[PDB]
Amino acid sequence: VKKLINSQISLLIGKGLHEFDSLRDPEVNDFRTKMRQFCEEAAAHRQQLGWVEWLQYSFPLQLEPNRALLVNVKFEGSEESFTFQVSTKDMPLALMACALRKKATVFRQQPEEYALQVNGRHEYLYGNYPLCHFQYICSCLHSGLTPHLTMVHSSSILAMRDEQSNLWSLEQPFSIELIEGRKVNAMKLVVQAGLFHGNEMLCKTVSSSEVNVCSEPVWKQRLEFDISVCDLPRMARLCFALYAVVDCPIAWANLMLFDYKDQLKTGERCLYMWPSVLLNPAGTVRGNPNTESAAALVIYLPEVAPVYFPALEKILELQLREILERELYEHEKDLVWKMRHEVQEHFPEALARLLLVTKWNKHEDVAQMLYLLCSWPELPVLSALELLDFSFPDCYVGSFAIKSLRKLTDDELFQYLLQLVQVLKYESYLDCELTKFLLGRALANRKIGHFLFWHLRSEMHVPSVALRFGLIMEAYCRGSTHHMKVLMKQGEALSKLKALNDFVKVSSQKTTKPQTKEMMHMCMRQETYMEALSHLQSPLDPSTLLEEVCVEQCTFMDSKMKPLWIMYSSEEAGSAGNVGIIFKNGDDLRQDMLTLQMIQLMDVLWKQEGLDLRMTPYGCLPTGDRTGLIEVVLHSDTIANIQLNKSNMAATAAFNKDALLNWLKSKNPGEALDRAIEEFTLSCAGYCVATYVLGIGDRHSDNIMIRESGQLFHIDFGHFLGNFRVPFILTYDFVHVIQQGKTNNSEKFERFRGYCERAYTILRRHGLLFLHLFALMRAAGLPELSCSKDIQYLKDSLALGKTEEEALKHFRVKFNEALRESW
């Protein structure tokens, strides 16, 4: 069995475990054994959890950030169901009391023994919360639907639990010998080397001698650095660039000067370099795994004595501030450092600014900073996120930052998971506090575990992270054997969708769409495909169950990559078991995921201030190499499709401007139309503010969709942050709907401007949260989130320098400009 598990892990993570063994690497070997132990302890703990605690782990509650209501309740193993009237303010317990009282009268005769499952989903209602605080009930109220729930007894939950078991002395200048290279080029070669602590140089860079593009180049020269060996900070990295000149970059390579056991490195090293686009301090400190073809540098680290970095106990041994403390001059820097005790004492949240003023290239000053740091009070989550930036390379700072993030709720962690995973790319060593933090949290919440897995799995085709990410996924698997098998099922479904999508691509260039679609259906109806594609948890949302694939309703779309549109149904889920996914292969989905996650965050922040813009936060999840899934919002269509203005159709208009309004009218007869116009106005405000703030341009009728409820949302975000200064967009046909069809309607239109202003001003108040998250996202390597000007785009769009009064006036001008332009 131990053999079988290992083969399953290798298959799941997309990398053979034997490959880790073959590295003969102590750091890898250490990581694997420590993390495996940690993860196995988490699993022991989980297996004895109380049944409510188990539910909390497996099906974490889905909550929103007086009225009558009908609810249908059945018991687990029964056809018989009952419809009860309850209040939105009632607790699930009261509901469960009704259900049991009804059961006992039927059967002729305790609520705390039960939880309520949402029919056909892995989602439960339990706890001390009014029904309307549950996302599901809340959702049912707005769409107008009846909640369907199933009474599940504690013994049944426990069966699920059960089925799922498993030094200071060295004053000589730092120096290296550059020995030789092995490489490709057209000119002379040079090696530039710098010593970095994060983004900051610890001293000047020092260049190599120019040697002809001949060879197999052979330097054999001492490069000496303008820094003492005792002043190298613990997280010092040495960064190289190999290039050509008569500039033409060739390659780069980084390494930590100390190893994962804190020992200073000696002597010779062979550096397999990464091909270029000159110094790249934020680039990985691990060699290029393509040793067959990568250019290679050999250096020698001279034996300076073995010295390990000094222990903490040894480290420990060794006005107008406010008016500025809200980029700084050197004298301003000097007062901050001078008054570092006051900073700790009366301005602890200004820790980052103090860290940025310490001289990381002098060990006495670092020991000073560290001394303060070790008694520094915990900071809020917002402050802690800033400290995860690459600007804060020191391990003690890193550790402090994680310590401060431990108070993150699961809902917050989930919201910031994408960025936390991306920060892993900044890590210097395999065994680190972030990895342990993410793994423990993942093992204590299955939803965390699910998305941690997919974020890591979706980048296994990236050589620079394959090893790190592979190792973490292995560790995770040791910690939950059952969930590994659930995840393997999803991977099997994704393997099949790829093969099917490849077929569809080929067929679409040879025959008519009707013919390709029929062939797609025959392929899907093969036993191997019916079995692979049915009965899985959605990678988009593990609480959504994808039961039986409805082949007859599957198709594909006409765009370049021919994305697949896959529908599912489930008898048990009734009608909320009718769900769709899109499989897309050929495009990088990371940018779309980021854009949707930031819009979802806006929706959270708006709702926390009592502003519900009726947004549509659907899933998007990269799963592999230019591969991933998109959640289908049903009962929606594109603005362009609605505006095709076909004859012999409900929405038949005298003027194209009336097409959308007419469409809305046909889906929302009578009284209902007014609320639909309201849903459209609210969502339109939300999306107009979001796409402006994030600089999403190229918005048109083919990438804007509308729900039959009136709710508008966006699809296919190819660009953001003004990378293909985007204006605020007001579209005429939308303004026409907002104005209820009327040419003049300032009452409705100005209500809509109010919504826009209220949404925009709320985001500004959280501007720093967006900034810190985008900062962390720079680790991802998206070409549209690659430098400062990308970030500056967000600063400008949020007008963060300005007072709220100025910001709003500025916004009002952009909005008014948008309205003029509206024809």
Ligand X SMILES: FC(F)c1nc2ccccc2n1-c1nc(N2CCOCC2)nc(N2CCOCC2)n1
Taking CB under 6 A as the criterion, the residue among 14, 398, 449, 563 binding ligand X is 563
Nearer to ligand X, 533 or 582 (CB): 582
Q: How far is CA 85 from the centre of its chain?
A: 40
Residue ranges in 406-445 that form contacts with ligand X under rule CB under 6 A: none
Residue 716 interacts with ligand X (CB under 6 A)? yes
Residue 705 interacts with ligand X (CB under 6 A)? yes
Residue ranges in 613-652 that form contacts with ligand X under rule CB under 6 A: 618, 620, 630, 632-633, 636, 638
Q: Is 351 left (phi over 0), alpha (psi -120 to 50) or beta?
A: alpha
Nearer to ligand X, 296 or 712 (CB): 712
Peptide bond into 216 cis (omega under 30): yes
How many residues touch ligand X under the rule CB under 6 A: the total is 16
Residue 592 interacts with ligand X (CB under 6 A)? yes
What are the structure tokens assigned to 196, written together?
């970095």
Quote the CA–CA distance of 125 and 114 in Å, as a whole number: 10
Which range touches ligand X (CB under 6 A), out of 172-180, 387-395, 403-411, 556-564? Answer: 556-564
With beta carbons less than 8 A apart as the criterion, state whether 429 and 285 touch: no
Nearer to ligand X, 343 or 418 (CB): 418
Nearer to ligand X, 372 or 632 (CB): 632
Helix spans in 282-373 (H): 312-317, 330-338, 340-346, 351-357, 363-373
Nearer to ligand X, 337 or 618 (CB): 618
Taking CB under 6 A as the criterion, the residue among 582, 756, 759, 799 binding ligand X is 582
Residue ranges in 344-373 that form contacts with ligand X under rule CB under 6 A: none
Closest distance between ligand X and the C-beta of residue 633, in Å?
Answer: 3
Q: How far is CA 387 from the centre of its chain?
A: 18
Residue 715 interacts with ligand X (CB under 6 A)? yes
Nearer to ligand X, 374 or 557 (CB): 557
Closest distance between ligand X and the C-beta of residue 603, in Å?
Answer: 15
Contacts of 478 (CB under 8 A, 6+ apart): 35, 36, 39, 40, 43
Placement of tokens 């592979």 in the chain: 470
Counted residue by residue, the chain has a size of 823
Residue ranges in 486-515 that form contacts with ligand X under rule CB under 6 A: none
Residue 584 interacts with ligand X (CB under 6 A)? yes
Closest CA to 365 of 391, 336, 387: 336
Nearer to ligand X, 73 or 621 (CB): 621
Residue ranges in 195-214 that form contacts with ligand X under rule CB under 6 A: none
Nearer to ligand X, 97 or 649 (CB): 649
With beta carbons less than 8 A apart as the criterion, state whether 569 and 548 touch: yes
Closest distance between ligand X and the C-beta of residue 732, in Å?
Answer: 21
Nearer to ligand X, 389 or 592 (CB): 592
Peptide bond into 267 cis (omega under 30): yes
SS3 718: coil
Residue 746 interacts with ligand X (CB under 6 A)? no
Closest distance between ligand X and the C-beta of residue 636, in Å?
Answer: 5
The DSSP code sequence of 720-740 is -TT---PPP---HHHHHHHTT
Closest CA to 451 of 494, 403, 415, 497: 415
Nearer to ligand X, 459 or 587 (CB): 587
Query: Which residues lie across from 437 on neighbouring strands?
Result: none
Closest distance between ligand X and the C-beta of residue 593, in Å?
Answer: 8
Residue 522 interacts with ligand X (CB under 6 A)? no
Nearer to ligand X, 56 or 627 (CB): 627
Helix spans in 742-803 (H): 746-765, 767-777, 788-797
With beta carbons less than 8 A apart as the criterion, state whether 253 and 380 touch: no
Nearer to ligand X, 311 or 644 (CB): 644
**Judging by beta carbons within 10 Å of its beta carbon (0-12, 13-18, 19+), is residue 661 exposed, middle or buried?**
buried
Query: Which residues lie across from 264 on neighbouring strands?
Result: 258
Instruction: Report the chain's C-alpha Rg in angstroms.
Output: 30
Quote the CA–CA distance of 623 and 583 in Å, as a whole number: 10
Closest CA to 728 of 613, 823, 814: 814
Q: How many other CB atoms are found less than 10 A from the CB of residue 634?
A: 10
- Position with the least CB separation from ligand X: 633
What are the structure tokens assigned to 183, written together?
């490489």
Kindly report the backbone phi and psi dihedral angles of residue 403, in degrees, each rounded to the nearest multiple of 5, phi listed first.
-55, -45
Nearer to ligand X, 93 or 633 (CB): 633
- Which chain residues interact with ligand X by CB under 6 A? 557, 559, 563, 582, 584, 592, 618, 620, 630, 632-633, 636, 638, 705, 715-716
